[PDB]
Every structure is written in structure tokens, then in C-alpha cells.
Amino acid sequence: VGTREKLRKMLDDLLVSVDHSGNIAVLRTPPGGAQFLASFIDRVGMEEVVGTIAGDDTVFVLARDPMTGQELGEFLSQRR
Amino acid sequence: GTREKLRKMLDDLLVSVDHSGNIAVLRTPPGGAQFLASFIDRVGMEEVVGTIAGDDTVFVLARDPMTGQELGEFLSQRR
Amino acid sequence: GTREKLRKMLDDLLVSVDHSGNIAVLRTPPGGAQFLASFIDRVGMEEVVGTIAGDDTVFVLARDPMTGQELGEFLSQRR
Amino acid sequence: GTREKLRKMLDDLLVSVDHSGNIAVLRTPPGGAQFLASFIDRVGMEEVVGTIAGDDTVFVLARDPMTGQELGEFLSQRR
Amino acid sequence: VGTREKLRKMLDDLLVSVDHSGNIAVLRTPPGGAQFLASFIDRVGMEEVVGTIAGDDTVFVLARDPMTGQELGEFLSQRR
Amino acid sequence: VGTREKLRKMLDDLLVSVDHSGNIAVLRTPPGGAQFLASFIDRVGMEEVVGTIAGDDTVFVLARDPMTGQELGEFLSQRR
Ligand SMILES: NC(=[NH2+])NCCC[C@H](N)C(=O)O
Ligand SMILES: NC(=[NH2+])NCCC[C@H](N)C(=O)O
Ligand SMILES: NC(=[NH2+])NCCC[C@H](N)C(=O)O
Ligand SMILES: NC(=[NH2+])NCCC[C@H](N)C(=O)O
Ligand SMILES: NC(=[NH2+])NCCC[C@H](N)C(=O)O
Numbered sequence: 001v002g003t004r005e006k007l008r009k010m011l012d013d014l015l016v017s018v019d020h021s022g023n024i025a026v027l028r029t030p031p032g033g034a035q036f037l038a039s040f041i042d043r044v045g046m047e048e049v050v051g052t053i054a055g056d057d058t059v060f061v062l063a064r065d066p067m068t069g070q071e072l073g074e075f076l077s078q079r080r
Numbered sequence: 081g082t083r084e085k086l087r088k089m090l091d092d093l094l095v096s097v098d099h100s101g102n103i104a105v106l107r108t109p110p111g112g113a114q115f116l117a118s119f120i121d122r123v124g125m126e127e128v129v130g131t132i133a134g135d136d137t138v139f140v141l142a143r144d145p146m147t148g149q150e151l152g153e154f155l156s157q158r159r
Numbered sequence: 160g161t162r163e164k165l166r167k168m169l170d171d172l173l174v175s176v177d178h179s180g181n182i183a184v185l186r187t188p189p190g191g192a193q194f195l196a197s198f199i200d201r202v203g204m205e206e207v208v209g210t211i212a213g214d215d216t217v218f219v220l221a222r223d224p225m226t227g228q229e230l231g232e233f234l235s236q237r238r
Numbered sequence: 239g240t241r242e243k244l245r246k247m248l249d250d251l252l253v254s255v256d257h258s259g260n261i262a263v264l265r266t267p268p269g270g271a272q273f274l275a276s277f278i279d280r281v282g283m284e285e286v287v288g289t290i291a292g293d294d295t296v297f298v299l300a301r302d303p304m305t306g307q308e309l310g311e312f313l314s315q316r317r
Numbered sequence: 318v319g320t321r322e323k324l325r326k327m328l329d330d331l332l333v334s335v336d337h338s339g340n341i342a343v344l345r346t347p348p349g350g351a352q353f354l355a356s357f358i359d360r361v362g363m364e365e366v367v368g369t370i371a372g373d374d375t376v377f378v379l380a381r382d383p384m385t386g387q388e389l390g391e392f393l394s395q396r397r
Numbered sequence: 398v399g400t401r402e403k404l405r406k407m408l409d410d411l412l413v414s415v416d417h418s419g420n421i422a423v424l425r426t427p428p429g430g431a432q433f434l435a436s437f438i439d440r441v442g443m444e445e446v447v448g449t450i451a452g453d454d455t456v457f458v459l460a461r462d463p464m465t466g467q468e469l470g471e472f473l474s475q476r477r
């Protein structure tokens with residue numbers, strides 16, 4: 001039903017919390033969820049996102065300068 | 081727990097099931113393997129000796145004498 | 160695809176092959192396991208029920224009645 | 239090496255042992271699977287065809303004719 | 318024997334080195350150790366830590382602003 | 398044939414793109430390639446690199462201050 005609405009649903013299904021410090025937004029997932037969530041982020045292609053790294057329950061998303069991790073995390077919290 | 085989380089996750093995440101020997105193989109979308117296997121470990125099924133998740137694949141070890149096919153059969157059935 | 164990417168990657172990445180039962184075991188250099196298994200999944204070999212990659216090891220599940228030794232034999236042969 | 243590092247790590251990391259077929263299954267605490275399997279690979283046991291570590295689970299492939307139970311038996315015994 | 322002393326012992330058992338640059342402290346582990354170490358960090362709940370990402374032998378720990386990676390790494394080197 | 402030339406060949410074989418923001422250079426790989434590439438980086442020992450974290454197709458490399466992610470990513474793009 002499109003990379004549009006799936007975004008939301010993936011976000012609502014998975015995002016436990018959003019935090020930030022500096023040029024990084026930190027996304028918390030349930031255990032094992034990090035790689036899954038970061039895959040869609042990479043795949044919708046946000047160009048204020050330089051890249052992402054997933055661990056097990058955490059994703060670091062790197063804001064493209066001048067954008068900041070707070071601005072980045074906000075841009076997300078509205079997609080939910 | 082499997083009440084509303086069993087079938088739902090499988091539909092959300094289980095792309096295909098295959099098997100060989102005492103192992104059932106679950107394919108997920110990219111990055112999905114750890115996440116689905118998290119749900120499987122958490123119900124704590126006796127016949128699941130254990131799970132290993134890669135990136136898009138999960139290997140489920142069936143407890144002998146149960147077969148990998150029989151095991152993959154069930155998770156397929158929760159759908 | 161296996162034209163120029165089959166033998167080449169194995170030479171680049173396959174350190175050793177071993178086996179037991181319906182499983183062939185591929186050792187790679189550190190961090191190499193996901194990368195090599197990516198190539199294997201992508202040819203989509205029928206007899207490969209699936210793959211799991213750790214850090215330097217890949218487990219390849221052979222589809223019964225084929226054996227893990229027979230399977231490891233082929234990838235060794237692409238070299 | 240297994241002198242002071244064999245039993246010690248297992249006590250530090252091995253939560254439980256199970257098995258099925260030619261595979262022994264080791265459960266670790268969260269995130270512990272790669273770390274414990276690192277120690278196992280490094281002794282280089284002949285009968286260990288190879289190891290794959292997920293997040294909290296390790297699959298140890300026993301070299302035929304040895305069984306996964308017999309293999310899990312030993313690591314249990316180093317405790 | 319508590320999330321108190323286990324901290325230390327986990328730290329002593331695992332921390333190969335601590336480094337830093339910017340808002341990140343970098344922790345080096347033996348191979349395969351990264352996820353294990355970062356699990357306890359997440360679990361003791363440090364609130365100057367926004368989050369952590371583990372690889373194989375490295376953990377990136379994100380300092381909460383205003384705190385810095387150096388201050389963060391020091392706060393650790395005293396727990397050992 | 399040495400940690401010298403293998404660098405290049407590994408880099409040419411694997412580096413899809415290089416990006417940067419702040420004190421981090423972001424390296425993109427094919428799927429599953431991230432851990433492999435970051436292993437060699439760690440192993441050639443660059444001391445303007447504090448550390449690396451690999452995911453599945455992305456590596457974050459932390460520049461040692463004063464060095465920046467751009468300067469870091471450039472130092473690489475010449476090794477190819
Ligand atoms: N089950 C675990 N491995 N837990 C620890 C995860 C460590 C870190 N937050 C990450 O996602 O990389
Ligand atoms: N992006 C990747 N690493 N893809 C390869 C996946 C390899 C294997 N199927 C696994 O799940 O472990
Ligand atoms: N750096 C490491 N984690 N080494 C241990 C590798 C464990 C196992 N052979 C795997 O590939 O999953
Ligand atoms: N945090 C998690 N990903 N937990 C699920 C672990 C899945 C499986 N037992 C493994 O070790 O690979
Ligand atoms: N055995 C390996 N995978 N080594 C490379 C690890 C790369 C990076 N330092 C990380 O921990 O993510």
C-alpha cells in the first residue's frame with residue numbers, strides 16, 4: 001500500500017522512543033528490531049539522513065549538516 | 081505469548097517457510113531476522129530447542145523426534 | 160548470478176569448507192560471513208534451503224536428500 | 239586455550255545447554271552469543287565443525303558420528 | 318550480587334580501551350564482545366547516555382548534551 | 398601482497414559511497430558488507446580514527462578531534 005503509509009505503520013509498530021544528541025537522532029526499538037527499522041529508513045531515502053547504523057534495539061541516524069539530531073527526530077515524531 | 085501476537089507477527093514478518101532435517105527455515109524481509117526470532121523465543125515453545133537469526137533468515141531447531149517440516153508447518157498454520 | 164561472481168567471491172572470501180549432516184559450513188575472514196552469504200542467497204540455489212551468517216562462519220542448509228558434504232563440494236569446486 | 243579460560247567463561251556466559259541431532263544449542267545472556275562463540279572457535283576443537291552466534295544463542299555443529307548431545311555434554315562438564 | 322558490582326566486573330572483564338571524540342565515547346572489546354558490554358550499559362540506565370550501538374568489538378555511546386564523550390569515558394574509567 | 402595494496406582493492410571492491418556529517422564519515426557497502434570493510438580499517442590502524450561501528454551495509458567511522466568526517470572521508474577517497 002506504498003512506501004508512504006508503511007512508513008507510519010512501521011514507525012508506530014516499532015519506535016519505542018526517540019532521543020537525540022548533536023547530529024544524531026537515537027531510535028529505540030524492541031529487542032532485535034533495530035536492523036528492521038533502519039532498513040525502511042534507508043529505503044524511503046531521506047536526504048537529511050547521511051546514513052544509519054542499527055545494533056539490536058538501537059539505531060543511530062546521522063543528520064546531514066546543517067540539520068541536527070533534534071530536528072531529525074522531530075521530522076520523525078510527526079510521521080507517526 | 082501468542083494471543084494477538086502469534087499470527088499477527090508471522091503475517092507481518094514471515095515471508096516463507098522451508099525445512100530440511102530437524103531445522104525449519106524462516107525468511108524475513110531485510111533486517112527482520114532478529115526481530116521475528118525474538119517473538120519465537122519469547123513464547124518458549126518446548127519443541128524449539130533454540131533459534132539463530134541472521135539478517136533475513138532464522139534457523140529453528142526442532143527437538144527430536146519432531147521434524148523441521150512439522151515445526152515449520154505450525155508457524156505457517158498461524159496464518 | 161554466477162558468471163564472473165561465483166568463483167571470484169569464493170576465492171576472495173571462502174577460507175575453508177567443512178560439513179556435518181545436511182549442513183555445509185563456510186569459514187570467512189572476520190566480519191565476512193554476512194557478505195559471502197549475501198552472494199549465495201542471491202543466486203537462489205534450489206538445494207540451499209537457506210543460509211545463516213554469523214561473523215566469520217556461514218551455515219548452509221542442504222535440501223534433503225542432498226547432504227551437507229555434497230553441497231560444500233560444489234562451492235569448493237567453483238575454485 | 240582452555241587452561242583457566244574454559245570453565246571460567248562457560249560459568250560466566252553459558253546459561254543452558256540443549257541439543258537436537260548433530261547440533262548443540264548454547265543460550266547466553268542478551269548480546270552474549272558472539273562473545274562465547276569466540277572462545278569456542280579459538281580452542282579449535284576438532285569435533286566442532288563450526289559455530290554460528292546470534293544474539294543470545296549459539297549453534298554448535300558436531301562432526302558426525304558425534305552427536306549434538308555428546309558435544310553439549312562436554313561444555314556442560316567444564317563446570 | 319547486584320547491578321552495582323557486576324558493572325565493575327563486567328567492565329574489568331571486557332573493556333580493552335576507552336577513547337572519545339566529540340559527543341561519543343568509544344569502547345573497545347575483545348572480538349564478539351561489543352553487544353554483551355553494551356547490554357549492561359543500557360541496563361544500568363545512565364541518563365547522560367542517550368543510547369548505545371554495538372558492533373563486534375566496538376561500542377559507540379552517545380553522550381547527552383551538554384555532556385561530552387571525554388566526560389562520559391572518564392565517568393566509566395572510574396567504575397573499573 | 399601486504400596490508401598496503403589490499404587496502405585499495407578492499408576499498409575498490411566494497412565502497413559504494415562515502416559521505417560525512419560532523420566528526421563521522423559514513424561508508425556505504427553492499428548488503429552484508431559493513432563488518433568486512435570495517436575489519437580492515439581497524440586493522441590498518443589509522444590513528445585519526447578513534448573507532449568504527451559496522452551495521453549491515455553502513456560503517457560509521459569516528460574522526461579523532463581535531464579531524465573531521467569530511468577530512469576523514471577524503472583521506473579515504475584517495476586510497477581508492
Ligand atoms: N540483546 C542485546 N544484544 N542487547 C544489547 C544491545 C546493545 C545496543 N543498544 C545495540 O542495540 O547495539
Ligand atoms: N544483508 C545481508 N547481510 N544479507 C545476507 C543475509 C544472509 C543470511 N540469509 C542471513 O540471514 O544471515
Ligand atoms: N568476532 C567474533 N564475534 N568472532 C566469533 C565468531 C563466532 C561464529 N564463528 C560466527 O561466525 O558467528
Ligand atoms: N535481542 C534479540 N535479537 N533477541 C532475539 C535472539 C534470537 C536468537 N535466539 C539469536 O540468538 O539469534
Ligand atoms: N570480526 C569483525 N567483524 N571485525 C570488524 C568489526 C568492525 C567494527 N569495529 C565493529 O565492531 O562493528
Ligand SMILES: NC(=[NH2+])NCCC[C@H](N)C(=O)O
Binds near residue numbers: 054
Ligand atoms: N539488510 C539490512 N539489515 N538492512 C538494514 C541495514 C540498516 C543500517 N543501514 C545498517 O547497516 O546497520
